[PDB]
């Protein structure tokens, strides 16, 4: 074991040297050309009320009109954000839902949490209501995040330090992704849905090729647990939020951190993260009940989405960049512009 | 306009159901249950039941519904799945008082300290079930206990005058059990600030009064929360 430890240390030193060699110029020294965007004075356009408990998760629809929200009151409520109307209200068998998903086709939602089971619900039944279409068991820890690739395949992250790619029709893990030491808190599919980055409670993110089932790259730099993660919209970078009150943008093709977003006044972690359509803004929800919009290129905060009465647990930006949504533990969703 | 009418009627049909479910959500008290498996926790669950990543127990006292959430098939790192349990009425923390991991009791002390000072659990009360009082009594009566080797402050600790020993209890038993309770209360009182309260109890795995203890503690918690709303506490 001593020889393997020494080889691991040598490989880590080699990787550090390789990362340092290609890091002659930082992001700011080049983005000084890019002009600042100024204050981003967004306002709450809609307030979605109906959840009786903290809304742990929320996901948009590809149409940028419908969205699904998951709450500890065990309700998966589907809101038409345009008219504030509720489209469906799924009672959950497990109240502790810590994640939810909306399929790209929109036919299926999903939910998971402390029950270790990822439940897939169908919104397009013959009756027209929503029932328990499928149950995907096989995780030995709490579900933290899940993402649909299609109507048949869904990728999930658990509290057992591993991710799992599920074939919905059969119910078996098409793939199992292992390599993290801490609990995996979030994941995000690439725009081409071929790679996905998962952040864990080891202060590290891992980029997995979905077809191979192997970890392509490991990105470090965070100091505490990583709570949320999301790709840059171009698909060749991503962002992470952690308990050390720093957001961190990495790039896959350089393997090393591009930018960090933190302030001295911020002493609370980032619980949710989501890029805008342009990739020029980065919306991060914080434990101090606020959500901040960061100028992802200039690394300075662009604005504050003040108005939430408790911890902001989740966010979501529309595909067309029309509107933002933020859930919270105040049981209120807020649609922002 | 037809689509808007259909959407509005569906939203009304959903909102009536949400109004119906709000009553049952507000009328049911959710309890977290925490502690090691060797501390008699599972026996407490069995006692409350006779009378998967998480296990539920639905019981009721005086027509009041209690929904207790035992944890199973989860990892030992609680720092991320504990934050889901702040809205609960209370955290029933079960301790093996006789288990002083050669020092399991110190592990319980540190876990309780972390729970007490967690920023999301700083408004959640803790009901403390020191569950191995009988085993502690057997250990201290036989003289092989010698809690001094595991806690030096046991010699200079003097039993408070407010202690209420059981009838027919060896004063060493009472002194040891109140020493452990005061070791917990040292953390509980410090950095408490009245936003959440600890309710140390001397329980046993086969007690029938555990449900009544939880009932009274939850009632007291709700009362004190209402008094904090009116700025009376």
């Amino acid at each position, epitope marked *: 074991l001593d020889q393997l*430890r020494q080889e691991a240390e040598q490989l*880590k030193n080699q990787i550090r040297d390789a990362r340092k060699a290609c890091a002659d110029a930082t992001l700011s020294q080049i983005t000084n050309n890019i002009d600042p965007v100024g204050r981003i004075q967004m306002r709450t356009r809609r307030t979605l009320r109906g959840h009786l408990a903290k809304i742990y998760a929320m996901h948009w629809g590809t149409d940028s009109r419908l969205l699904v929200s998951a709450s500890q009151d065990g309700k998966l409520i589907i809101w038409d954000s345009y008219t504030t109307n509720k489209v469906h209200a799924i009672p959950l068998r497990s109240s502790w839902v810590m994640t939810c998903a909306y399929a790209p086709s929109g036919n299926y939602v999903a939910c998971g949490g402390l029950d270790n089971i990822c439940s897939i619900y169908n919104l397009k039944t013959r009756e027209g209501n929503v029932r328990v279409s499928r149950e995907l068991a096989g995780h030995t820890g709490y579900l933290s995040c899940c993402r649909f690739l299609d109507d048949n395949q869904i990728v999930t992250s658990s509290g057992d*330090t591993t991710c799992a790619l599920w074939d919905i029709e059969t119910g078996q893990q098409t793939t199992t992704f292992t390599g993290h*030491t*801490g609990d995996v808190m979030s994941l995000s599919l690439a725009p081409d849905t071929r790679l996905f980055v998962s952040g*864990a*409670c*080891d*202060a*590290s993110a891992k980029l997995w090729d979905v077809r191979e089932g192997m970890c392509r790259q490991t990105f*470090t730099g965070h*100091e*505490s*647990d990583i709570n949320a993660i999301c790709f840059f919209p171009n698909g060749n970078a991503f962002a992470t939020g952690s*308990d*050390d*009150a720093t957001c961190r943008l990495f790039d896959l093709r350089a393997d090393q951190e591009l930018m960090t977003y933190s302030h001295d006044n911020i*002493i609370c*972690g980032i619980t949710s993260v989501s890029f805008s359509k342009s990739g020029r803004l980065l919306l991060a929800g914080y434990d101090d009940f606020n959500c901040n919009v960061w100028d992802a290129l200039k690394a300075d905060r662009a604005g504050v989405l003040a108005g939430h009465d408790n911890r902001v647990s989740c966010l979501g930006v529309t595909d067309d960049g029309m509107a933002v949504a933020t859930g919270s533990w105040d049981s209120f969703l807020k649609i922002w512009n | 306009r037809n689509e808007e009418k259909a959407q509005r009627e569906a939203n009304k049909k959903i909102e009536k159901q949400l109004q119906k479910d709000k009553q049952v959500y507000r009328a049911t008290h959710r309890l977290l249950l925490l502690g090691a498996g060797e501390s008699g926790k599972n026996t407490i669950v069995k006692q409350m039941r006779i009378l998967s990543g998480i296990f539920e127990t639905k019981f009721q006292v005086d027509k009041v519904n209690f929904h207790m959430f035992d944890v199973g098939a989860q*990892r*030992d*790192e*609680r*720092r991320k799945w*504990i934050q889901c349990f702040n809205d609960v009425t209370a955290i029933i923390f079960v301790v093996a008082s006789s288990s002083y*991991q*050669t*020092n399991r009791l*110190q*592990a319980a002390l*540190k876990l309780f*300290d*972390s*729970i*007490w*000072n*967690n*920023k999301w659990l700083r408004d959640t009360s803790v009901i403390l079930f020191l569950n191995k009082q009988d085993l502690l009594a057997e250990k201290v009566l036989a003289g092989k206990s010698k809690i001094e*080797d*595991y*806690f*030096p*402050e046991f010699a200079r600790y003097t039993t408070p005058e407010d202690a209420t020993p059981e009838p027919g209890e060896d004063p060493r038993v009472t002194r040891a059990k109140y020493f452990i309770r005061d070791e917990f209360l040292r953390i509980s009182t410090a*950095s408490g600030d009245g936003r959440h309260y600890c309710y140390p109890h001397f329980t046993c795995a086969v007690d029938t009064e555990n449900i009544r203890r939880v009932f009274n503690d939850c009632r007291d918690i709700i009362q004190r929360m209402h008094l904090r709303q009116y700025e009376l506490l």
Partner: nanobody
Amino acid sequence: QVQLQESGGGLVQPGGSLRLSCAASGFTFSNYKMNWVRQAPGKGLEWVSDISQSGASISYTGSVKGRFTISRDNAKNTLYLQMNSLKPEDTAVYYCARCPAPFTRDCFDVTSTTYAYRGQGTQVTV
């Protein structure tokens, strides 16, 4: 990456003295509470001592009170444990843990079976 490397462990006769040093790299030492934990041969992880951010607040387990002394040099980003009057039941692997989140009073999962922010440990045989 979070790196905690221990040194100073070794073989000592009962009643001897020793000094465990913990070098921390990859994080801001002054903002995290730090803990000394130990695993005895054939037993689970046990918590030995903890010290707060600035070092003002210090706590020890019962079995090491008076004997050992925890401290931390924030300028050198290191954690010290002065071992005095050692006993044969003090033989164990000593890991230098870190609290999971900064600025927070509570430390969770320092004595967990797989903790991501804990050192590799140093053997102390008495």
